[PDB]
Design a protein around this ligand. Structure first.
Ligand code: HEC
Ligand code: HEC
Lengths: 108, 108
């Protein structure tokens, strides 16, 4: 990979401070500004049901792997021009690594 | 993605004619020349237990997604220099697509 396992604990707190505002990760969690992320890994972009995605994300049709998720998080709009995810991104690979480690584990 | 779903039926027969010689895909299937492929998607390269992999594959530490699997199949040795998988590859994207479609489904 080009993703290195980080601290799932560190990633949990990054999630809460950077992602929670718009998303849930638990199975059965609701869509909010952003879609619930349970089971995101291996799923393609813009496929959660009952969520209204941008045309851009559906069509980018990104396959979510720890690798892909990394570029996305780096700079969402640069990666999927047109996305309405209003996040400036996680510029440090160390933060991304911790977050993805946490997300790999909690969205399963 | 850059992978398009094909014919799972077509992929089953490509598997049997090109992959079966060295691999099994069923859960509980044994390692043969090549490792059993059950649950390969989302797993990193060189991690099936009880199989003796090349140094190269372990270290390539490729994360298996439909996308990755595609490049691999295209030309194994060009993608993982040092691998002992003795396959010349699947040059047509249409064949790859059918195979991966089948593999996505059978290795789950
Ligand atoms: C609101 C201010 C958000 C914050 C903070 C984060 N995300 Fe987000 N996300 C948001 C929206 C509005 C959308 C949908 C975009 C669209 O163009 O329709 C998303 C989407 C995602 C995705 C893609 C989901 C898919 O089903 O394809 C992922 C993987 C994602 N968001 C993850 C994520 C993470 C891990 C965040 C914290 C670093 C995060 N987002 C912040 C809104 C918002
Ligand atoms: C014997 C002549 C093989 C044929 C035909 C195919 N594969 Fe293979 N595969 C083979 C070996 C000896 C190995 C291990 C390589 C090493 O360097 O140790 C592999 C490995 C794979 C992998 C990687 C597995 C992992 O656990 O990381 C995959 C995804 C794979 N093989 C798939 C595959 C497919 C789909 C094939 C048909 C087109 C196929 N292989 C042919 C041996 C042989």
């Amino acid at each position: 990979t080009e993703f290195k396992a980080g601290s799932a604990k560190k990633g949990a707190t990054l999630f809460k401070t950077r992602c929670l505002q718009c998303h849930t990760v638990e199975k059965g969690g609701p869509h909010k500004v952003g879609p619930n992320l349970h089971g995101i890994f291996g799923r393609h972009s813009g496929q959660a049901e009952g969520y209204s995605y941008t045309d851009a994300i559906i069509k980018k049709n990104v396959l979510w792997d720890e690798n892909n998720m990394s570029e996305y998080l780096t700079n969402p709009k640069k990666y999927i021009p047109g996305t309405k995810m209003a996040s400036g991104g996680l510029k440090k690979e160390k933060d991304r690594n911790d977050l993805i480690t946490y997300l790999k584990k909690a969205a399963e």
